[PDB]
Write a protein that binds this DNA or RNA. Structure first.
Ligand SMILES: [Mg+2]
Ligand SMILES: [Mg+2]
Ligand SMILES: [Mg+2]
Ligand SMILES: [Mg+2]
Ligand SMILES: [Mg+2]
Ligand SMILES: [Mg+2]
Ligand SMILES: [Mg+2]
Ligand SMILES: [Mg+2]
Ligand SMILES: [Mg+2]
Ligand SMILES: [Mg+2]
Ligand SMILES: [Mg+2]
Ligand SMILES: [Zn+2]
Lengths: 118, 25, 92, 60, 206, 155
RNA sequence: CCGGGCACUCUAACGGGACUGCCCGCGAAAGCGGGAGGAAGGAGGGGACGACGUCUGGUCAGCAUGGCCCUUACGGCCUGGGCGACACACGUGCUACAAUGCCCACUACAAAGCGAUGCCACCCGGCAACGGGGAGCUAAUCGCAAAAAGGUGGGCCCAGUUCGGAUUGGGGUCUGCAACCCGACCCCAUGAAGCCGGAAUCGCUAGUAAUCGCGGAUCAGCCAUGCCGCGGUGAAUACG
RNA sequence: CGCGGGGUGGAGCAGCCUGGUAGCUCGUCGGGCUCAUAACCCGAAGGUCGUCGGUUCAAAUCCGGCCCCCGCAACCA
RNA sequence: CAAGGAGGUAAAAAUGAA
């Protein structure tokens, strides 16, 4: 069911199916279905349409999620555009933000190795 | 998941406690 | 022209004139050698008898070695009129 | 910086976190045991001397 | 080479301590520093006595200090000085019961610290070291010893080349625990540097 | 240089069976030193044997081992920078070890989901002479078969 | 928990206890093999102990010390920066790629050590880190600690997936004068690479390898996945 | 200046004629092996195809103009 | 039982330091 921006997860437990949304994770998941009052271990296969409506209405509202909060997150990094701080430059150069070790490692932001040789 | 900060197992390994591992009872 | 240092003491003597990285009695010695390696346009100029010049062997291939004093040698790589990796090392 | 540096180690004023341990027999700042007030080096010397009350070789 | 200090190697069985007091934390550190400063202050103005040991015992403000010496010539009869303020100058940073005793080491030729110290004096007298070693060993061996061994290392007779002079008669088993082996050491200060003298003296046990 | 001929290690007999063999098999199942999980899996699979066949697992397991026994194996030996492969006989100790090892390995090679059903099935297949371990056994004997040429080098 | 008792367990101090002494066989002897003997054996299992000497080995930055040099300075104080830099290369490791596995709940079984300028029971707030209280403990008395793997129950169903946790946004807490460079945790949300490793390369022969947690030193705090120890479950194989 | 052949990674060579794929050996770069070098093993990167035009949907390739290279020819008086 | 004289012999693996 097209809950937020997504619909994908069929026969696979609503507490888990919920996770498949940028903004839900695991904590907001069971938090949303206990506050909506729905059984977590259900089929996800389009069960009681009412439960699905209530779920959708609560989840999609309340807190920001999916493409909207991706925009906000990207905009929070755009904050350090202008004449920003040190943390912005780390987002500029493509290097790790939290001042860690970059002599080795840091491949998750630098990307795969390039090898200079000399 | 000895390095995940959201498990009783990772909380053991890290040492610290919390929500995913309460200080007993 | 000297272009890169590996030895910090050597680096400081030639750049700032800081002599506290080398022996005190080898200050003048090391200086005249470095200036020679700086002015040298080819390895053939670093050939005065008092230098005992020679290229190293094995893993140190591509390097050269003039003699300061006793068991002490200034090693470097000379290439295209320039020396690189100026070090202050031991004969053993 | 060694003589004026074993001065500060006993001087200990100005912010409580700027104060640090320091071997007394030597002037070592590293591996200084709080129990003896000595570095690991000095401690070994005196332990072999016998000048360390009760301190004895460990075999087990 | 690499060999463990024959004193520390015993400590428990054979060869007891040299500073025998008990304390828990918050006290050990202070009392050990004071203890060592006593050893440091004594060694200075008491070297002419040539002290084999500096035993120390404590019992809450009691601080007993036993100074073993070959010839206690620097004590000189009660109020003849060399003891009065001398055993009283300790309590200028102590203020506790400065009970200073003096022992008479009978044979100095059987006291390892004294042997090495006599040798180290001779190095500074510019003596022929190899001959000095030989004599000192025989001198120790002459006074009833079961085994002896003296070692001077480095810069022998000046001359640019660190050497190591070696001599040892009789029996010196360092590996054995029931050993009763006395170990001494001394720094010889020379106008050309510093060299160390080891001295091993051995007697029976079981 | 093996001055001592290294005496054969002896095991503890299991529970309910008394095997001088089953425990050796449970040991191969054992990973990270968890004999509890190891023994459980085997006895679990023993319960599984009872279902698909009306046979006592003490024989099903026994015969399976007997069918996954290498009569002769290939051995690389001397002269020519160790160029030859003399086909050697296999000692009862080694047939023993290979049988159980190949069983467990082939068992975990199977596409099944539970460790017990893999063990049970691989044992039933091996008891018949069908298991992937039996493949391994028959394969090792092929190699030993093709080398009869310089087998006379023996030793 | 009390009365009382301390035979068991434990605690820690001196002892006993195998020396192949005893049997068969081999042998000139030494010794070797084998057997009842007992908890134990033919150095019982681990430590501490490192010959004469070798490497012009290592260390003038622990310390000592010959010589050379510096002294309105190569010394002294301070604030700040740096040792944490990053196109890359190598070492030692940690966490994994899952179902003999992961999550949640319940429920057991250790040893070795550390603590009243601290460990902090038990309550109270808090999703939690933690904060408010506050009892006991100079500690085989009180506390750190519930050991974890295990067991029982239940849920995922093999899918980059409830595997994996990197990276990143946001919100907090604690030490500290202060944590931007550069602190550790907590919580929400993101959830990357990895589906098991080329040529090569390492460790281990019995409580051993593997796997599991626990303590300590340093230490205000902590970048500890390290080092030094402790016990839990517990393999495989040795022809040669 | 007259005919024929040829300019392609750092080096030597293919691919052109039957337009849509640039391949081989060596060398370079990274990693192994060794005390170390060589040899060897693993894994990589690297070419305006001489230049200016033209044809074509598309040119290393098909067609012209120059620019070098190499090989033949230059004879009868 | 105790051997003299007789004969087929390793591999593919090269170098050296300042
Ligand atoms: Mg011994
Ligand atoms: Mg040297
Ligand atoms: Mg010094
Ligand atoms: Mg550093
Ligand atoms: Mg992938
Ligand atoms: Mg998979
Ligand atoms: Mg062994
Ligand atoms: Mg290479
Ligand atoms: Mg090579
Ligand atoms: Mg003609
Ligand atoms: Mg050559
Ligand atoms: Zn010190």
């Amino acid at each position: 069911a097209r809950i937020a921006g997504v619909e994908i997860p069929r026969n696979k437990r609503v507490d888990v199916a919920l996770t498949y949304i940028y903004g839900i994770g695991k904590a907001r998941a069971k938090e949303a279905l206990e506050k909506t009052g729905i059984n977590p271990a259900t089929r996800v296969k389009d069960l009681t349409e009412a439960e699905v409506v209530r779920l959708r209405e609560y989840v999609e509202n309340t807190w920001k999620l999916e493409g909207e909060l991706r925009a906000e997150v990207a905009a929070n990094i755009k904050r350090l555009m202008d004449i920003g701080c040190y943390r912005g430059l780390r987002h500029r150069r493509g290097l790790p933000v939290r001042g860690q070790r970059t002599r080795t490692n840091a491949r998750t932001r630098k990307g795969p190795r390039k090898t200079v040789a000399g | 998941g000895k390095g995940d900060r959201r498990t009783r197992r990772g909380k053991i390994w890290r040492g610290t406690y919390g929500k995913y591992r309460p200080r007993k009872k | 022209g000297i272009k890169s240092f590996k030895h910090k003491g050597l680096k400081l003597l030639f750049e700032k004139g800081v002599t506290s990285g080398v022996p005190a009695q080898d200050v003048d010695r090391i200086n005249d050698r470095l200036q020679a390696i700086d002015t040298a346009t080819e390895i053939g100029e670093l050939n005065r008898q008092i230098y005992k010049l020679h290229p190293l062997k094995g893993d140190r291939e591509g390097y050269w070695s003039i003699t300061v004093r006793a068991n002490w040698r200034i090693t470097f790589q000379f290439i295209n009129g320039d020396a690189y990796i100026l070090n202050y090392e031991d004969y053993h | 910086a060694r003589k004026a540096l074993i001065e500060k180690a006993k001087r200990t004023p100005k912010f409580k976190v700027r104060a640090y341990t320091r071997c007394v027999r030597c002037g070592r700042a590293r591996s200084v045991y709080r129990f003896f007030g000595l570095c690991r080096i000095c401690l070994r010397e005196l332990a072999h001397k016998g000048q360390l009350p009760g301190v004895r070789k460990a075999s087990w | 080479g690499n060999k463990i200090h024959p004193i520390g190697f015993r400590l428990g069985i054979t060869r007891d301590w040299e500073s025998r007091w008990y304390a828990g934390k918050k006290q050990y550190r202070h009392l050990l520093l004071e203890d060592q400063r006593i050893r440091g202050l004594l060694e200075k103005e008491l070297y002419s006595a040539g002290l084999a040991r500096v035993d120390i015992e404590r019992a809450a403000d009691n601080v007993a200090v036993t100074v073993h010496v070959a010839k206690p010539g620097v004590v000189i009869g009660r109020g003849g000085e060399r003891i009065r303020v001398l055993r009283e100058e300790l309590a200028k940073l102590t203020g506790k019961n400065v009970a200073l005793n003096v022992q008479e080491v009978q044979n100095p030729n059987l006291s390892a610290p004294l042997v090495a110290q006599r040798v180290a004096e001779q190095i500074e007298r510019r003596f022929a070291v190899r001959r000095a070693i030989k004599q000192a060993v025989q001198r120790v061996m002459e006074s009833g010893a079961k085994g002896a061994k003296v070692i001077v290392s480095g810069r022998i007779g000046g001359a640019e080349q660190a050497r190591t002079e070696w001599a040892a008669q009789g029996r010196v088993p360092l590996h054995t625990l029931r050993a009763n082996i006395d170990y001494g050491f001394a720094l010889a200060r020379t106008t050309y540097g510093v060299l160390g003298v080891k001295a091993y003296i051995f007697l029976g046990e079981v | 240089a093996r001055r001592r001929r290294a005496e054969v290690r002896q095991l503890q007999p299991d529970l309910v069976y008394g095997d001088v063999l089953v425990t050796a098999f449970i040991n191969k199942i054992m990973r990270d030193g968890k004999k509890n999980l190891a023994a459980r899996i085997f006895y679990d699979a023993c319960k599984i044997i009872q279902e698909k066949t009306g046979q006592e697992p003490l024989k099903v397991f026994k015969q399976a081992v007997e069918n996954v026994k290498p009569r002769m194996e290939v051995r690389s030996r001397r002269v020519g920078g160790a160029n030859y492969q003399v086909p050697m006989e296999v000692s009862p100790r080694r047939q023993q070890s290979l049988a159980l090892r190949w069983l467990v390995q082939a068992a975990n090679q199977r596409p099944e989901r539970r460790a017990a059903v893999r063990i049970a099935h691989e044992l039933m297949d091996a008891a018949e002479g069908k298991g992937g371990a039996v493949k391994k056994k028959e394969d090792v004997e092929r190699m030993a078969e093709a080398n009869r040429a310089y087998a006379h080098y023996r030793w």
